[PDB]
Each structure stands twice: as C-alpha cells, then as structure tokens.
Design a protein around this ligand. Structure first.
Ligand SMILES: Cc1ncc(COP(=O)(O)O)c(CNC2CONC2=O)c1O
Ligand SMILES: Cc1ncc(COP(=O)(O)O)c(CNC2CONC2=O)c1O
Lengths: 382, 380
C-alpha cells in the first residue's frame, strides 16, 4: 500500500506483543484474554492489532458493534469475537453464520429474535449485568430469569457468557469498585447455572487485581501501552510500552520580518526575524484546533505551533533555518525530548483513549514488527 | 451498502445543489466555480458532493493533497482537480498521468521535478502567492521569476493559474483583507503574462465581493450550507441550506432510583426517579467527550447527555419512558427544535468547519437527492 502526503502514524506492533504477553504471564493460566479492538483497535488498525494480540496469548476479540466484527471476518480473522454493544434482532442470523457472539440485556430483544431465527447455526450470547455503570445490562431478577428462560427454550440460542463492566476500576480509591464487584457476586446467584465464561475486568481491574478476574479479561487501553488513568500509573505490575507515534515533515520554510501575521484571523505576529515552518497536518487529521498553544518536535527541540490550526496544515516557529523535508514529530520521541499521548490529552483536556481514536482515516498507519516495516494502511488509498 | 448499528449521518445533496447553483447565478458567465472537496468533502462524502456540485455549475474541484485527488479519479470523477497543498517532486509524474494540477510555491521544488520528469503528459501548475496568510506561497519577486522561468523552460510544465488565500475574509473588518487584495494585485505584475486562471477567493470573499474574484472562485464551507463565521451571516446574498444531520436510536431505556450513578467516574448521580436512555454513539464516532453537558433531541424535546461520554455510547435523561428504537437527533431537526452544527461548535468551543470533519469513518452517510434516498456509504 502507498501514500502521497508526508504525514503518517506509526504503530509499533512489538510493543503490543509485549503488553499482551506480560498479561498472559500475570494472569492464571485458566483465565483467557479477550483483546478488545473496537474503534479500529483504538485507532491503531483492527486486524493488525488483532493478529498480534492473538499471537501473544489472546484467544478472543471484542468489538463495539456488528459491522466491526464483520470487517474482521472479511480480513481473515477466525478467532471468536464478541460484540460488546447492542445489535438488531434481525441480524441474529448473520451473527450466527459468521460465528460472532452477541451481548444481550433485554428480554424483548430475545422475544423478537426467536421469531426471526430458526437454525441451523447456534448464536452465542453473553448476558450483560448492570452493577453500577448505568450503561447497558439487566438490573432485576425477574428480567434476568426471563432472558435465561427464553434462551433455554430456543434450541439454537446458547448462553456462553455473563459479564459486567466497572465505572471506577481506574481510581486509586476502590469503594465503588467494591460495591460493583459485590453486586456482581450477588447478581450471579440469580442464574440457575454458571455459564462457561464469567468476566468483569477491563485493563485497570485485571492489572490491579489479577486474582479477582474469574475466567476471562477484556483487555483494551493497556494493550496499546497507555495507562488506564493518571491515578494508577505507579500501581501497574509491569511497564507499559506506548505503541502509537505521529509524524510529519516540513513542506515549507520561510523567514518573516517583524510585523507579519500568520494564519486564520491573523492571530500571530512575529516580533523579531523568525523562521516559520509549515507542516501538512490539520484538524481534519484529528490534530484539533484546541492544540494551537501546544508544540511539536523538530530536530530534537520543542517548537511552538504558531497561529490558528488549519484543516490540513499548521505553522510552527523554528529555531532557525531548517531544510524542507525535516521530520517533525507530533507524538513520539526525538532525541531526549518526548511528547506522549497523555501530554496531548492534557492539553486537549481529555483522557488518552480519545487521542488515537481522533487521528482520522486520512492519516496512514505504518506497521512495524521485529523493528522492520510490515505494512502500510492508507484508508483513502487506491 | 448497509450498516448494522443504529447511528448514521444524513447528507442532503439537494441542499448542496442549491448552494452551488445560487452562486452560479450570482457570478459572471466567465467565472468558474471550483468546489472545494477536501477532507472527504468536509465529512459529507467526496464523490457524492463533487458530482452534485458539477451538476450545479462547478467546473473544477479542489482537494488538499494527492491521495484525495487520486481517490476521486478512482471513483469515476473525470473533471479537473487542483491539489491545494504540497506534494513530492517525485509524484509529479503520477499527477500528470491522472490529469491532476499541482500547487507550486518554491523554486527548488521545480528544479527537482524537472530532473525527475521528462514527459510525455503536461503538468499544469498553479502558483500559490503568500499575501499575508503565512501558510504556503511565494513572497519575493525573484523567487516568482525563477519559478516562471523554470516552468517556461520545460516542455511539459505549464503555468495554468496562480492564486492567493485570504486570512480574514470572514471578518467584518476588511482592513487586513484590503491589504492582501492590494498585495496580490501588485505581485501579479511580477508575471510576464497573466495566466488563464487567476483566483483568490474562498467562500467568504466570493459571497461578499463576487466581482473581485478574478475568473475563478474556490467554494468551500458555504457549499455545505455553513457560514464562514457568525459575523458574516447577515451579509451573505442568499440563504444557505444546511446539508448534514446526525441521528441515532435508543438501544436501552431504564428507570434509575436516586443515589444511582451513571457512566465513567460515576460523576452523575440520579436525584429523582429518572428514565435514562443509552444511544450507540461515542467519542470514537467524533462525538467528543467535551459534549457531556449538551442537549440532543428525542421526541421533539431537548434531553441532556448525562454522565461521561464513552467510546461507543453515551446516556441521556429522557422526558419519560420512551420505547427502545426511538430516534434521537444529535444534529438536525426534530419537528419544532433544531440543533445546528453551529450549536455543536459553540459547545466544543470551535468553528463549524471542525465538526462534520470529526465525525468519523465509523458513521455511515446516507445520501438524499431529489428528495429520495440515493445512496448509503458505510466505510467499514
Ligand atoms: C464492555 C467493555 N469491556 C471492556 C472494555 C475495555 O476497556 P479498557 O480499553 O479501559 O481495558 C470496554 C471498553 N469500552 C469503553 C472505553 O471507553 N468507553 C467505553 O464504553 C468495554 O466497553
Ligand atoms: C487553498 C484553499 N482554497 C479555498 C478553501 C476554501 O475555504 P472556505 O471553506 O472558507 O470557502 C481552502 C480551505 N482551507 C481551510 C479551511 O479551514 N482551514 C483551512 O486551511 C483552501 O485551503
């Protein structure tokens, strides 16, 4: 695959292998790892991360909605995939044919699906319980038993799993975590029998309490080498390896005289004789306008973004006359200096999860494995 | 195509057709309209918009970088395309072969392209001048002459046009605008002969000063029915139709008791007996976390997003117990109420340009033309 703009993101797949393998070491052998690659693997490349995670010890994959699961199938992934979110009852036949497990949390969904499906493939369900997140999931005993009965009555419906999700597993203070875990324990007793897969842990819960994970963990953010929250960094068992880096190159260089203005709204004004560089990356690439007072790395040094950010490019003050084509690093390391996703996140005033997800389809992803380039993936490519 | 999640964007091509045809009426027969269709047509869909604009009166298209132009070509667009940004001298042969015009602003670029390309297709260049924007462009007299000379000197290099871009055309205060307009008229004299296409205007300057747009207007944001700025709104010649809307459906409804918490960090606490709905859209869809206190529309009413926004989902406080499957409009009209992209931008503390751009590849686009569903575009 190829790309024709000097702006690209690099994804280090060795880092992803390490982050997942260290977890395989940490957890009991009887506990499986479900790698969650929703949102195109948190903006890292769905099938590439999936292939790598399965190599390091993962056995299942999790995705947010049906299309994401189907896309993984079309690219040759044969491992089990669980759709964590909602789906249409009409799509039950397609899920069953493609061996995609579904999350279920209401009986009226099942009422509706028994009526539209009748074999021959089995559909594996994972009952979702709401123990305090308030998102999706059952909350009463009458509804829990209704779902289980409806599943038991259809010969092609199978209850393969049961799970919940924590809202504060990444907080140093475990008070709410405890209420939720205890509630899950109370809620599991409402089932006539334990299905084979009971899971509740996300990255934070499984890295902090490996013995409290039952038989399957849903590993996300930590797989990419990003800490679940600033709170728990020191509580992490093994060092995490950041996998995403973002780069560009100088396409224009020029010296300004005192008084000349730069960019939209002509916000910036040079005061001495300064060198301004232009890079081909803007907000349509996920490098949002709010980052106008941030900086990038040029030739081992910090250089500020100058003026407002444009849709496809932005300007930065240079230390002096640098050659056109000089590599600029937006996220990553250049010498002794480094800009991490948490740094960008802080400036954007968000969590690290939101940063790689926002780097758009427009930006090519170059995959590295064994310290060498594996493949290039340009979404708007030929 | 089709999609398997109840979250989708709707693009009204009729709106885009009207926005272009009205300008086509407002401008002189001699003047071309170059529809700016970069960034997947500002998140509206590149081919679908390019095609609609050409039908409405545009004769040319403009893209940001080479990959966006090659993408239009591969989808059947055969109209002229100008790359507004930079490209590699080594890709000039590809641009030529695919009939893509390139922006040029540095003499060393040409010197390099010349050594690499010998023929046989001609390459049409547009000389970009920097008149106070500080982005791309030539600034001195002898750099201009060197570029012109390098082009004149090569058998397959053709200078088809030259242009500049205004930094403050959307500003009521036209003082920096007049400085740039004047600088341009002056720099045009460093050229021996005025090329066939001279352009300077973006949506703002073309709708504000249509006669001072030489013979080609680059039409962007206004094509999509969005004003360049809130200040320019009551100075525009015709009403713009908004083309983009975003929708979802309730996938869960439940009643919460007081003291019960919602979402990450448990930052929302139910105070009364509330009905809470879950919709399948989150920040990976471009519905950023910062929209946490914003109102969406459900059943003709404003309903707040309650608790933190997740990667693929978020919750809202419902007026009452509504059925699962109820349509929620995030951007658009629900009977009496409307949420415009300008409203979303206000809350995100940005400009409308950024909003449809941010809604991701994950969200399907459904197209309407002649008041009927024309096409569905699902990226994954
Ligand atoms: C049901 C479920 N399990 C596991 C995960 C993995 O979480 P981590 O990447 O922190 O290990 C998620 C992510 N869902 C997200 C993430 O952000 N918002 C969400 O709804 C999830 O929804
Ligand atoms: C060279 C060029 N011409 C015309 C346009 C159209 O602008 P309008 O949408 O206001 O009519 C743009 C968009 N450039 C933008 C828009 O936002 N940031 C940019 O760099 C452009 O870069």
């Amino acid at each position: 695959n190829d790309f024709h703009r000097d702006t690209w993101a690099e994804v280090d797949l060795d880092a992803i292998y390490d982050n997942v393998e260290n977890l395989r070491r940490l957890l009991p052998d009887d506990t499986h790892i479900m790698a969650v690659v929703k949102a195109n693997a948190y903006g890292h490349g769905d099938v590439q991360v999936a292939r790598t995670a399965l190599e390091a010890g993962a056995s299942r994959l999790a995705v947010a909605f049906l299309d994401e699961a189907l896309a993984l199938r079309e690219k040759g992934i044969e491992a089990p995939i669980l759709v964590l979110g909602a789906s249409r009852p009409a799509d039950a036949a397609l899920a069953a044919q493609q061996r995609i497990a579904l999350t279920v949390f209401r009986s009226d969904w099942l009422e509706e699906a028994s009526a539209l499906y009748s074999g021959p493939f089995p559909i594996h369900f994972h009952l979702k319980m709401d123990t305090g997140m308030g998102r999706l999931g059952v909350k009463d005993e009458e509804e829990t038993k209704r779902i289980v009965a409806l599943i038991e009555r259809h010969p092609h419906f199978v209850l393969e799993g049961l799970y919940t999700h924590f809202a504060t597993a990444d907080e140093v203070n475990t008070d709410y975590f405890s209420y939720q875990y205890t509630r899950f324990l109370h809620m599991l007793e409402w089932l006539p029998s334990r299905p084979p897969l009971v899971h509740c842990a996300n990255s934070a819960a499984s890295l902090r309490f490996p013995d409290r994970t039952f038989n399957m963990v849903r590993f996300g953010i930590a797989m990419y080498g990003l800490a679940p929250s600033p709170g728990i960094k020191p509580l992490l068992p093994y060092p995490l390896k950041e996998a995403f880096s973002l780069h560009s190159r100088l396409v224009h260089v020029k010296k300004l005289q005192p008084g000349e203005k730069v960019s939209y709204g002509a916000t910036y004004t040079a005061q001495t004789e300064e060198w301004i560089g232009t890079i081909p990356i803007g907000y349509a690439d996920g490098w949002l306008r709010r980052l106008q007072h941030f900086h990038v790395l040029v030739d081992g040094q910090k250089a500020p973004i100058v003026g407002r950010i444009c849709m496809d490019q932005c300007m930065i003050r240079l230390p002096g006359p640098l050659p056109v084509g000089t590599k600029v690093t937006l996220i990553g390391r250049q010498g002794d200096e480094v800009i991490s996703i948490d740094d960008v996140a802080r400036h954007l005033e968000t969590i690290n999860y939101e940063v790689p997800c926002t780097i758009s389809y427009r930006v090519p992803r170059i995959f590295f494995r064994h310290k060498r380039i594996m493949e290039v993936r340009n979404a708007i490519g030929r």
